[PDB]
Design a protein around this ligand. Structure first.
Ligand SMILES: *[C@@H]1O[C@H](CO)[C@@H](O[C@@H]2O[C@H](CO)[C@@H](O)[C@H](O)[C@H]2NC(C)=O)[C@H](O)[C@H]1NC(C)=O
Ligand SMILES: *[C@@H]1O[C@H](CO)[C@@H](O)[C@H](O)[C@H]1NC(C)=O
Ligand SMILES: [Ca+2]
Ligand SMILES: [Ca+2]
Ligand SMILES: [Ca+2]
Ligand SMILES: [Ca+2]
Ligand SMILES: [Ca+2]
Ligand SMILES: [Ca+2]
Lengths: 211, 217, 112
């Protein structure tokens, strides 16, 4: 099977550079042109350039001529993309993809680049207290980087949950999660949000208590 | 340098009906008797997936529900009938000329019956206030269609600054949307006011859905 | 009777010279008598490609006087060095096969 395997998520400071890799396997590496494609926040595609490994011919989108540098290592079947002088405008998913002479036929899984000045910061977690149904909440504020995991009652409470996408505000992320439950069950039974933040190795529990 | 204009940006289709997506190119994408126009599908977390190459050739494994046509500068992807697995973003792409270029994308969502938001409002926790911040949270849950307006009022006065909104994509199970709205103030400011109001304007009602609290209870 | 293949002709027929990333589009025309059916079969140098994606899927025919033409096209969008070589188009009627060839060169420079 043909596979393209991309390097993992990168968190890089503004002004610095990053070098992202695409490892090819399952085919003769030198024979196929490899292209790079940029996507910001799951919508829109922008072509960056291609590299032909056999003789290392490279072609750039003029928009990326000063920003991207493409190289290859034949011995390890890897194509590299370097991105320099980074700013938040460069934060995106970067895909590598193989072209076969007809179309892009295999794609890497994407590499997330996040350009940020922030250091690892655990979230502050706040309980959100106020029909036959009552909505409760959990505010998860001021963390870096993504992601966090939010469960209710150690995952025992799954239905009627809406966990919202994070918004970046002043270098740090904030999200909320709502649960809607029968009013007969709260506050007479305990409702707790559990918030995990892998980067900081933290996990906190917050019990929703009546004001 | 070829610009692809794809429309509509978003499309809400009912299960079993037809969807038509258009791509207009700023100049011909034809040469040598071929049209170098391609169609892709992309779902969240995944790379794009080829549906149609050179305007009208169906990729192996793609159902014949998917159909492409056009030439020169005007192209159409038809999907007929729409299965629920078609919920995705669709892209046109030209390879007639460098740089390779894509259309902006068309997001395909499903139609359902209109549904008013369920709105809930929350005061700052005593723990947040203890640090020195004050966030006020409003949830606007399970609504259709997508278009909604959220307004904050503090003591009867519209507030615009310090507001952050977060929107969900369409829920795959019930075809509704959801949204949060958070207003962040200082503790000093929060303590200066009594009445707090989140207000939702939606297609379903002529009157806004208003949720409110008094800081003094 | 009307079962003869008159000729099989490639266009361009010679002197095709490409750079890496450029398009190759080759026309193959079989001129025949009125009653003939034609199946086309291409040979090409590169083992990168399925025949299905390179060769046209639509029917390309023409009738006029007491003759028919059958057109087959081979397209590679973005050639590489392994696409340099001999391209052969064979046209078969069941009774007979006629073929024609051309050499395609791929230079190692990016396409303009
Ligand atoms: C291969 O054959 C076709 C003709 O069948 C040529 O492609 C186009 O032909 C249509 C009409 O059939 C015209 O409208 C286009 O303008 C032609 N394309 C152009 C501008 O090249 C094709 O050119 C042929 N290739 C060669 C070199 O003979
Ligand atoms: C092959 O093409 C050449 C040049 O077009 C032509 O003279 C010749 O008749 C063709 N041969 C066949 C077998 O049709
Ligand atoms: Ca410059
Ligand atoms: Ca292929
Ligand atoms: Ca141009
Ligand atoms: Ca005869
Ligand atoms: Ca020469
Ligand atoms: Ca090109």
């Amino acid at each position: 099977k043909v596979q393209l395997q991309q390097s993992g998520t990168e968190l890089v400071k503004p002004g610095a550079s990053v070098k992202v890799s695409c490892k090819a396997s399952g085919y003769i590496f030198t024979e196929y042109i490899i292209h790079w494609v940029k996507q910001r926040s799951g919508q829109g595609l922008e072509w960056i350039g291609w590299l032909y490994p056999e003789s290392n011919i490279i072609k750039y989108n003029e928009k990326f001529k000063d920003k991207a540098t493409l190289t290859a290592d034949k011995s390890s079947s890897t194509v590299y993309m370097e991105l320099s002088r980074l700013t938040s405008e460069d934060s995106a998913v970067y895909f590598c993809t193989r072209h076969d002479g007809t179309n892009f036929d295999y794609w890497g899984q994407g590499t997330t680049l996040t350009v940020s000045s922030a250091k690892t910061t655990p979230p502050s977690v706040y309980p959100l207290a106020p029909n036959s149904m009552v909505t409760l909440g959990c505010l998860v504020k001021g963390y870096f980087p993504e992601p966090v995991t939010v469960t209710w009652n150690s995952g025992s409470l799954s239905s009627g949950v809406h966990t919202f996408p994070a918004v970046l505000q002043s270098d740090l992320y904030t999200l909320s999660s709502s649960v809607t439950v029968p009013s007969s069950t709260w506050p007479s039974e305990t409702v707790t949000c559990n918030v995990a933040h892998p980067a900081s190795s933290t996990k906190v529990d917050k019990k929703i208590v009546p004001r | 340098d070829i610009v692809l204009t794809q429309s509509p940006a978003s499309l809400a289709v009912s299960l079993g009906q037809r969807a038509t997506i258009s791509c207009r190119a700023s100049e011909s994408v034809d040469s040598y008797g071929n049209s170098f126009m391609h169609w892709y599908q992309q779902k969240p977390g995944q790379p794009p997936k080829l549906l149609i190459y050179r305007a009208s050739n169906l990729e192996s494994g793609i159902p014949a529900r998917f159909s492409g046509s056009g030439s020169r500068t005007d192209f159409t992807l038809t999907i007929n009938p729409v299965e629920a697995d078609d919920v995705a973003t669709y892209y046109c792409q030209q390879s007639n000329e460098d740089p390779l270029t894509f259309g902006a994308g068309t997001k395909l969502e499903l139609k359902r019956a209109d549904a008013a938001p369920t709105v809930s409002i929350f005061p700052p926790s005593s723990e947040q206030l203890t640090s020195g911040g004050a966030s006020v949270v409003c949830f606007l849950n399970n609504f259709y269609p997508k278009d909604i307006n959220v307004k904050w009022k503090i003591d009867g006065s519209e507030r615009q600054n310090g507001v952050l909104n977060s929107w969900t994509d369409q829920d795959s199970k019930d075809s509704t949307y959801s949204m949060s709205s958070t207003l962040t103030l200082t503790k000093d400011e929060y303590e200066r006011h009594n009445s707090y109001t989140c207000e939702a304007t939606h297609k379903t009602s002529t009157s806004p859905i208003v949720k409110s609290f008094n800081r003094n209870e | 009777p009307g079962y003869r293949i008159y000729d099989v002709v490639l266009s361009p027929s010679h002197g095709i010279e490409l750079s890496v990333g450029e398009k190759l589009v080759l026309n193959c025309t079989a001129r025949t008598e009125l009653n003939v059916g034609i199946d086309f079969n291409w040979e090409y140098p590169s083992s990168k490609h399925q025949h299905k994606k390179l060769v046209n899927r639509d029917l390309k025919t023409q009738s006029g006087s007491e003759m028919k033409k059958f057109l087959s096209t081979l397209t590679i969008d973005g050639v590489t060095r392994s696409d340099q070589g001999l391209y052969t188009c064979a046209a078969s009627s069941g009774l007979m096969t006629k073929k024609n060839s051309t050499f395609v060169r791929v230079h190692e420079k990016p396409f303009v």
